[PDB]
Amino acid sequence: LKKVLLCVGNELRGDDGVAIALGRLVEEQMPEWSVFFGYDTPESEFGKLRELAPDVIVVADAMSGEIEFLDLSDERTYLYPTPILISYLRGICSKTIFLGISVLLENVLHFSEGLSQGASDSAFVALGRIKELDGMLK
Numbered sequence: 001l002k003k004v005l006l007c008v009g010n011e012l013r014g015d016d017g018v019a020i021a022l023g024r025l026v027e028e029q030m031p032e033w034s035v036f037f038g039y040d041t042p043e044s045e046f047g048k049l050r051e052l053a054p055d056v057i058v059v060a061d062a063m064s065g066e067i068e069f070l071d072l073s074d075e076r077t078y079l080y081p082t083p084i085l086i087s088y089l090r091g092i093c094s095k096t097i098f099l100g101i102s103v104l105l106e107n108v109l110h111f112s113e114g115l116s117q118g119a120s121d122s123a124f125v126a127l128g129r130i131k132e133l134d135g136m137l138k
Contacts, residue, residue, distance in 0.1 A: 001137060003033045004054040005130065006089070008061040008082060010040045015107035015119035018126075019060040022101070025127045030134065042085050049092055056137065057089050058130065060099040064108050067122070068100035069129055097133070101126050 007023035010016045023035045034052070036045045042059075049057070061081050072078045072086060073094045081100065089096045101122050115123065 001056070002052060002054040003056045003134070003137065004049065004052065004058070005033055005035045006042060006045060006049075006057060006059045007035065007037050008039070008042050008059065008085075012111060012113060013108050014110060014112040014114070015103035015116055016062045016064070018062045018101050018103055018115060018119045018123050019099075021115055021120070021123040022060055022126045022130070025123065026130055029127065030130065033130070033134075042082070043088075046088065046092075049089070054093050054095075056095040056097065057093045058097045058099055058133070059086065059089060060101065060126065062103045062108065062119075063100040064103050064105040066102040067126055067129065068098065068102075069133075070098045072096045072098055099126060099129065 005026050007019045009019045011020050026033050027035045038045045063081050070077055103119050107116050
């Protein structure tokens with residue numbers, strides 16, 4: 001069963017690379033998952049995506065202002081950060097799942113490389129949920 005994790009974010013903007021961090025974790029712990037780093041140009045990954053025809057796409061991102069985890073295959077759910085991205089993915093794949101990792105806005109406003117303890121913890125918590133989703137998929 002083909003499972004993709006598309007990681008979005010900018011590693012030069014602090015905690016805005018949290019989803020890049022998560023990507024590296026899945027890459028290590030979860031070989032059955034193929035991880036695509038889109039960084040800040042996720043669209044650069046559509047080619048590979050069409051070509052691989054995944055069964056499941058999880059798209060992960062920092063969201064500034066906890067973890068949002070939703071199946072955008074559900075229409076009601078779709079209806080109510082990456083809008084044009086997300087609707088493209090739903091077109092490649094029915095099981096498009098969004099995973100939002102909330103970050104502090106003060107932590108994404110600077111040129112800064114690396115995560116805050118909080119965002120770091122958040123990425124491990126997010127790994128947790130990918131693992132939970134993985135189990136459900138069996």
